[PDB]
Design a binder for this molecule. Sequence first.
Ligand SMILES: CN[C@@H]1CCc2c(ccc(O)c2O)[C@H]1O
Lengths: 50, 281, 334, 281
Amino acid sequence: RKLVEQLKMEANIDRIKVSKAAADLMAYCEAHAKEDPLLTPVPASENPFR
Amino acid sequence: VWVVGMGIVMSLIVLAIVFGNVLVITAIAKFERLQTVTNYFITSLACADLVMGLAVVPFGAAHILTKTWTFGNFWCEFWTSIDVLCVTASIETLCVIAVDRYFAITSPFKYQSLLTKNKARVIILMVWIVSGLTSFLPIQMHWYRATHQEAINCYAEETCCDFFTNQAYAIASSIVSFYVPLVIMVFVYSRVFQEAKRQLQKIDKSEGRHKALKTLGIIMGTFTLCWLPFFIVNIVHVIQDNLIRKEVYILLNWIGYVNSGFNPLIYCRSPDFRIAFQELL
Amino acid sequence: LRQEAEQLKNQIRDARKACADATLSQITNNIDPVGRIQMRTRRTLRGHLAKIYAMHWGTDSRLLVSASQDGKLIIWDSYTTNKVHAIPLRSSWVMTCAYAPSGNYVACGGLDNICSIYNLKTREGNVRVSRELAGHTGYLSCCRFLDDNQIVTSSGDTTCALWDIETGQQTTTFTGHTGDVMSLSLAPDTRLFVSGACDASAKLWDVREGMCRQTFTGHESDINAICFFPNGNAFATGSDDATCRLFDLRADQELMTYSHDNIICGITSVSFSKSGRLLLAGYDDFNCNVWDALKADRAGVLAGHDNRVSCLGVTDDGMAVATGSWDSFLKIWN
Amino acid sequence: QRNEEKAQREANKKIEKQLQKDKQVYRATHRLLLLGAGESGKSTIVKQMRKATKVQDIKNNLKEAIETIVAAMSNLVRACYERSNEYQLIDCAQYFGIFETKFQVDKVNFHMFDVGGQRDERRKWIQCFNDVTAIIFVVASSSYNMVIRTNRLQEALNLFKSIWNNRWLRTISVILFLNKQDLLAEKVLAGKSKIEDYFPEFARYTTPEDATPEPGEDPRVTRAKYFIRDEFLRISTASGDGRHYCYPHFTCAVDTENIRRVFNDCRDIIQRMHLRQYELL
Ligand SMILES: CN[C@@H]1CCc2c(ccc(O)c2O)[C@H]1O
């Protein structure tokens, strides 16, 4: 029924190699790593908690 | 060398009591899961046992090992009063725990409303106040002092400090501390055992395909065997002076002391308590 | 009919396999490990009467909203650990809650069909329900806000719906899940979202189009939690199965899986950090876990709660991770 | 900035006071659950445990649904009542969300919850019912022959087995009700449908040595009822570890004693939970 048509429509989509996507995600994570206060310990004065 | 073994035994008993009560209190206070309305009585009993094992047990051991008591008269009176307060508080707290279990089992629907954190703290405060009233007040004002010639020089002398008591205070202290809680505990445990037997019979009848007796036996017999002889000789030596000697009195009193160390071992037996002990240690 | 569907599924599987050149672990094998991280609670919250199942951080890094089975949805200030609002609920059973991006509205789900939206900022400081969303024909599981007017809900009727607050009727209905949908997470651009059902299939929806663009059904057991990567091109799915998997939108396939031998329990909530390096995941066991996204290696464990952790939350500023559990007490971790 | 903090703290205090006041009521009340098929008879128990034109319209809608069920049976390969056992599931029709019930017994406030799901095959929302005192399982014991395109009773046993063995409902007991006792008696007395025809174990099954039959029950009816009860109890106690128990009950279509039975069952459940918590059973 409509499920077959929906699956056929979903199958026809552009695909980007997993290597490129993984490299882009890793690059974003490395570039924005310093902004995260969880990875780098928060200074006591700057920490809103305690 | 004979007293060396007695000193070692006393030190071991004091250390065991202190360590057990400290561990029980730390487990009860550190983890919020163990914090419960019914656990407040348990931690009160643990605090009383810790206080007794810290104050009365070491000073009593020092008095036993060395005959001379080097501290002042006022300090020895304070030590005796602390001993009485701790013993009375421990027995009253055991009675209150038994009463709480009886209310929880016999009256399950009304137990939730009857018992609350404020109610539990009020009960604990009343227990400690009534323990202090029967310990601090009659001892500091010298109401328990004897009238006969003996022990008057002991009261005057700094070295001698022994538990010599008139007729009135012994019976009243026994009734306030042990005898009434004994009767209350026996009644509220017989009722609970009857309820447990009824429930087991119902289970057996409903489904074709013991522990209560052993648990009640442990809980009642440990306390009774540890404390009843001491209070019975407390009544006796006033009823008949020549019957009771000093050594029997001291050994029975120390058995009552070590009951405090035995108490958390048989009371803090819940699986949650075991998990807390494993995590802490 | 079935033959064509089977052939199309085989073709899409072959295309996904062909698009798989190098795995994420192979590429990031030379990256520096995050290392052990010491996360300890700074302020522990309390006040609830029963088990909470969900919570949501505010747009500001201060306020919280949490709902429990006592029937009370109470708003908290995480900086001072003092309650701001206490909103009683018509239904004693709830399954989710949400916080408006502007902060003026709070919406909660429930085991009943009805979804309720409450007014926070009103005259004289009175809390009241603005609208009662109806007609979803199933127990609701999640709620998120696109804006102050649009809300997307997920229920047990295997359908996700997009509602309009003013009209009170769902604008668009999403269908395609064999099992019931449990969790969803919006995109930073508020134009895409994904949903994890009970059939292990996590599908991606387009709010404007109303049709599932992609479908990721690479999991084994039912999905209990889901959340976007901060970039918006990836998302991680929690499940009753111990494994936690990170999918991809541009690659259309799974990249990494997070499984350990010791953990045999389920997963209830998953949330990334601000940078996405750390993947926090609550577990059916009393402890949660922290995973290195680019290395699939655990970098910590937090066993603060005494019951099963049901909800996770990371602030928009990324300051602290707040985790609740079936124990009434909440804990803010930093 | 101090004034804002003070006002917010005062608001916190007021909210906490109101929250404690509501927590008292929440702890006072108890929670229960209704569970079973639509044809099991949960509506009959709800009426027993607790707009005339609207009622007549509902009756007309039920008659229309009966006609639709007759048409559905005609799709399959007074005369339709004999074949209605294997036909589509429908109401009796022989005349020719969530539901919350709040009732109190002996000044104890109970609160009742209905399943509300007709086709909740996954039934995974059941994990949220862990604060309930008991689960009232309602099943029609007379549905041993009405098959669903396995017998309905076998489906009930499968549902009960899945519910009993749950990673979350381990501490939750189950109250069990068996409606259609008169219907079961009528169906077993007649030879149209035999228990051994669909349940082979009944041929080798014998009546229990210890059983309590009503004065107006034939031996065959008692044998069938006790066989069903024994099967349910076996499924319950096969994996039981003493944490939770099943309470079978033989109830008729109309009976006012159900509320008292639920009260007694809940009291026994609370008593046994308290006994096991303290390790006295
Ligand atoms: C010397 N130690 C005292 C003496 C008598 C006594 C004790 C405790 C509780 C009482 O009610 C008593 O009468 C003992 O701890």
